[PDB]
Prior knowledge:
Chain A has about 100 residues and is low in regular secondary structure.
Amino acid sequence: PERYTWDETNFGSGRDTRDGFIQSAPLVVPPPLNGILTNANPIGTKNDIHFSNVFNSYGPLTTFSHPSPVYPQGQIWDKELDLEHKPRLHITAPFVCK
Amino acid sequence: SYDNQTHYRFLGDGWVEITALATRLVHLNMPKSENYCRIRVHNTTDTSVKGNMAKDDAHEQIWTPWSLVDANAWGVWLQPSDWQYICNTMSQLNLVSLDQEIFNVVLKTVTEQDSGGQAIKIYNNDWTACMMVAVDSNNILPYTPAANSMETLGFYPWKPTIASPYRYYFCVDRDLSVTYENQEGTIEHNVMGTPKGMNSQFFTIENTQQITLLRTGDEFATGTYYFDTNPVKLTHTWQTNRQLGQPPLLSTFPEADTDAGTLTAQGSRHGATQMEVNWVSEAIRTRPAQVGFCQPHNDFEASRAGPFAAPKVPADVTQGMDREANGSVRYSYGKQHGENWAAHGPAPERYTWDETNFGSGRDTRDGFIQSAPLVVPPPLNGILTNANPIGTKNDIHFSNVFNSYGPLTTFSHPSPVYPQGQIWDKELDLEHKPRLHITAPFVCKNNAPGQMLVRLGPNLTDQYDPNGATLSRIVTYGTFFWKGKLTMRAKLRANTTWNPVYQVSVEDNGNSYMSVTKWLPTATGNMQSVPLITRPVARNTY
Amino acid sequence: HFSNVFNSYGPLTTFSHPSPVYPQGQIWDKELDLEHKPRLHITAPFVCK
Amino acid sequence: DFEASRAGPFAAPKVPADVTQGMDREANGSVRYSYGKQHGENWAAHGPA
Amino acid sequence: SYDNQTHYRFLGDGWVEITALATRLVHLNMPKSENYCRIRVHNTTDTSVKGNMAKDDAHEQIWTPWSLVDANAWGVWLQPSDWQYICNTMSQLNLVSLDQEIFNVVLKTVTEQDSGGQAIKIYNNDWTACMMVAVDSNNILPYTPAANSMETLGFYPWKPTIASPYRYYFCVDRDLSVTYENQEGTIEHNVMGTPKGMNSQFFTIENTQQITLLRTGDEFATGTYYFDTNPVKLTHTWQTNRQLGQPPLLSTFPEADTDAGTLTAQGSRHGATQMEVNWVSEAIRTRPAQVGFCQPHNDFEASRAGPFAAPKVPADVTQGMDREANGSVRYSYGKQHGENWAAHGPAPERYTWDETNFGSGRDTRDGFIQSAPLVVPPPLNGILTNANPIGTKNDIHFSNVFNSYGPLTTFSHPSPVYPQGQIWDKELDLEHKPRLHITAPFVCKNNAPGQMLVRLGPNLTDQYDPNGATLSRIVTYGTFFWKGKLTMRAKLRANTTWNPVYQVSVEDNGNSYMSVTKWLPTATGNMQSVPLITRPVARNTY
Amino acid sequence: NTTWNPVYQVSVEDNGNSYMSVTKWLPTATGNMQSVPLITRPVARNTY
Amino acid sequence: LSTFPEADTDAGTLTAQGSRHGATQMEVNWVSEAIRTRPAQVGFCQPHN
Amino acid sequence: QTHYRFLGDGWVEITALATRLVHLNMPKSENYCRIRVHNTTDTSVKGNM
Lengths: 98, 542, 49, 49, 542, 48, 49, 49
């Protein structure tokens, strides 16, 4: 079966792990070594496992764009889950019957 | 008719129609760049350093020969005293409508003559000359908050002011690698980039708005935009997950005004918790929800634009003095937007505002996390604290990477700052909006107030050739008045406590933060505008 | 371990409201006077809008 | 997750959910109640327990 | 009220009312020649050469102290982006109406004083001064397309522009003989000539139009000319005399996606041709008509006016790259009418537009002609090709003198070019009109838009004597705005194919012809206007 | 249309190695063909 | 902007980070694009795999 | 086919018309089946899960 990977075009909302870092305490101009964790520091005794693979930056100020559908193959609508508290959206399809 | 006051129209049930009247003289010069410029900016002087990268100022804005007129700052409408009256009496506020006007347009030209004597400059107006004004009512062009750089209008009535030239951002795709102190090796690649064909957007004031020419005896007036926003409380909370509901039952009563009372045996005490322990305590007892939350400290993320500090919801600084932990903000204004006038050097005055929504802030020092079936005295490896190094880094603890946000996570909206503080703000054209904005308290649910632009009419000379490189143009500059009307709705608070509540009062000439002399002119007429407390009266969350 | 500090909450994160307990269980509950309310309360199933 | 503000330390509430085969109670926010006589519990039970 | 936009009003059945709004500042100086001049021009510097004669610029125009204001150029109305939107969505376009306006007339005078210091120039307006405007609504005076020399108005809104002085032709009767390279002997007679009494026509703005004086606070407005023209398709054809109707019947079907199928024995195959051969083939089979035709290459004819290049109907360049064979056009604009601003030297930028009406073009290389009762393999003297010298000349073949035009000769109307390109054009007062014009796509069936003329009022000095040779006049110059309204009708194309069609898209910063950076300002604000594809979507002729 | 500079359009291209090759949506000598996903949101917007 | 390019090659400059107006959430006495306050958060970091 | 009906203010009523021949065979299982699926062939591996 033929395959294809669709990369969203909502630029400015994506993220590059390489450059993603985090400083510490009262911000210092040139961060020390133990005063700034980067995507090169092993977590939980694992070399390839960095903060990126476990960090969740979601929050109140976290605003984004709804995913665009794909012409062929792409799904149109989708039923909503019978859950008391619905999810902000679905990835399976762009349109969800309220 | 000039007018710069504030009228309070009282209605029934305790509702007031606050009216803001702001008039101010403006000054404008010939926009140097006769054409739109797509200038780029790269501060290699700092980005090249190993430890530096948080000082990154790389991007590529587009300069327009137009100047924006933004009055989105409380410090330009209300009067110092007025803001006081409000915060001390009101209990909530909300925007109603806006209205702007322009008039008394003066256009003069300069002629540096007297070449046979010394070097004097002669002035004289020109009627035929014309100014150009337009209003992005549909909000086509990018939004540019003047307070987003402290370039609004003067906060002092009897002192004129100038407009901040209009300039917006553009797509480029910057890139920078991570490096610390000295480290070892090179900064990999600190590339800038070129414009992409999919994200290129070059607008033009001319092909977007209906410009209007205004001569000497002309004048312009806008419509009457109606605000569709949500009101903001003018009180602060304090309660925390410890003070929520039925307090523990008392079994011991104090004998004197010194000693305290006691509770019931933790083991043999009624209640309910989420732990497997067979006892009860304030620290573990169940609560209605979560008051505030833990936010990643100094979280610098990066996209195609480059690195940036992820905004964080302002909250109480807590006893821990954790400013950069609860998102407190630090401002840098100057002269017109506050700061003393007798201050020498270009050094801009600063101030860090710590939110007063107590009970929602967090202290990292005490923040900890236990493990597995909760144990009374936690072992050593059975409890992580803000003293345990993560990812081989000593100063990097769970706090600087923990995100406690969640469903039960409820909080309070940030209160605005009197001077400098921003009023409203356009909403992002994103399918899923953010619960709020920190840039300002009020966000237009629908369309927002169209931005106002201005530009002096290009006054030409006798010698003009389009094909000719760069050619002359008679020197010119202009001034005009600006009248603004801002109506708002609010309700007076009700006195229900008993014990007098905290009021925003002033104090005799002293070292006190609230010194009258701070808002009073000097022997020469200098003065400043110090930010004022918003939400002086306590509220009650539960 | 990561479990004791990982927060998987997010946009796609959908769930079900907690069911009340017959005896003892609480019925309704006042809402916090906060500008931004919490998606729900655990103290009780019903919250007066 | 024990956080702390000006009030002091406290257990951050967590949305109740299925305990799962893992018997993870304090992981899915299950709740433990402590009633007495009037609010349930057998009447023939001795001690304030 | 200034305005320079483009509104698309959608109606029913897929028809749109496109509205063009163009406003622009203009500049005008005192017409040096206070009176009409009948100047002559003879370039003996080149006409004297043996090989030169195609550079002949001999004639005798008449200079008028008036400046024409022509906005007959798409590049001045529509915005780059807009033209795109159109070509990609529309399927045809046509002119509707025109409307013009003038206002904010500024009149200033210069006084070069400061003779006792250095040499400074002082400026100051004058109300009493007056400008003069008139409109050749009846079209008495000769027609002068400004785009017929790229002297229209600026294509950039935020950049002012000037008018091209008015000047028309006059009868003289020039003469020049034929000569090549060096040849031998003299250029016979390269005579100019004098004015004939039967073809002498000297008009005067004053005795033809009702001039109107406009001072500082005055303003003028034209009527509302309604266009009576034929719409032009916004799609290109491809089909040729080979692809017209029922394709040959297939007898063989391919086995894989590599090999092809076959037809039926040419001899034993049904159909009909105009040859006496007892077989059939695509090349000889009869067709509904003739798609395009052969045109004489570099056909220089000559009348009493002198030699000139006989215009030829633009068509597809064909694989043969035959530009000067299918009448492709080469333009030479500058700054205002396109071209990059950062280009040094007076060197004007050029561009050759190759028509996209494929199937109508011709390739000389393959063009041949057989003889008498057609023979399968043509002999040598029984078939003339584009390799046989005619009239003792090696490079001169039948192609450069063959005219394939005829009854069955059908073709497609030339598509306009976005920037530079001309819009409409007056029709020749000839009893028998030409099937079309190449200068522009739209030709007014009836009367055409009256041309607009302007002239500064002759401001005199105290010292004036009519009988006195040449006398002074206070230095003066003026500026004014010009608003234009252009409404048009068009219908949206219909998506009927299946396979996505060709769209006029842009591309990331690359070497691609469609680079975004090409229409974007520079670090200093420079930019150009590159011609754009018209008729991006394919059509279908049969 | 409010920009000025032509915006990105979903166009096709002559028979080439380009992702947007017409031959990709055209039948073969035997009638075979495919359906390649297409770009959604070719025109840029503006969030703020 | 305080510096304007001379040609279509070089770029312009800004104002001294230290002596430049604005507002950030850090305790540093300067300003820069990377630290300056923003209306909200555009996108976010998500746990990988 | 697909019809585009244009209205005022720039709004369009896009209509989608889809017709297609379908084929169906006798459902092998004359009754509802509660079949289970376990890929022990892969779940047994150490790295696989």
